[PDB]
Design a protein around this ligand. Structure first.
Ligand SMILES: COc1cc2cc(c1OC)O[C@H](C)CCn1cc(nn1)CCCOC(=O)[C@@H]1CCCCN1C(=O)[C@H]2C1CCCCC1
Length: 128
């Protein structure tokens, strides 16, 4: 599946090189610019537990998910991963618990020590 392909072929985009956040680019974006901390970022995404037991989609709102990068509005893996993406890019991320919800988890929706998978489309980003 997509998660196994990321485990085997995905690029380790963590500073520590601890394989906590693995990325495959699925569709190449436009320009060389990736967003800065503070930037308002617009995405579509699908996400799941790597077990597949809970599935979440911005598409089911029919509206993009918007957040400010690097302000801890999202799990650490998103601040790291979306920061590497270009306008128009689609990427897959596989995420160890340390860069998501950790040992505590986020019950009842996310269990302790959960690995997460996302597909993310970067639609746009705009300066603060
Ligand atoms: C732990 O709680 C949730 C996790 C996730 C979705 C959740 C959620 O309930 C708050 O439903 C919301 C209704 C969706 C809108 N949204 C985004 C965030 N907060 N709300 C941003 C903060 C929390 O989410 C995250 O940081 C990540 C990245 C951004 C998209 C959503 N994220 C998730 O972790 C999903 C999660 C993915 C795996 C399957 C279960 C849902």
């Amino acid at each position: 599946g997509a998660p196994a392909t990321v485990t085997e072929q995905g690029e380790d985009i963590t500073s520590k090189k601890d394989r906590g956040v693995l990325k495959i680019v699925k569709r190449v974006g436009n320009g060389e610019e990736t967003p800065m901390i503070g930037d308002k970022v617009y995405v579509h995404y699908k996400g799941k537990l790597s077990n597949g037991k809970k599935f979440d989609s911005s598409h089911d709102r029919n509206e993009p998910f918007v957040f400010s990068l690097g302000k801890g509005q999202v799990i650490k893996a998103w601040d790291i991963g979306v920061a590497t993406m270009k306008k128009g890019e689609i990427a897959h991320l596989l995420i160890k618990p340390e860069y998501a919800y950790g040992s505590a988890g986020s019950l009842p929706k996310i269990p302790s020590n959960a690995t997460l998978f996302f597909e993310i489309e970067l639609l746009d980003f705009k300066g603060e």
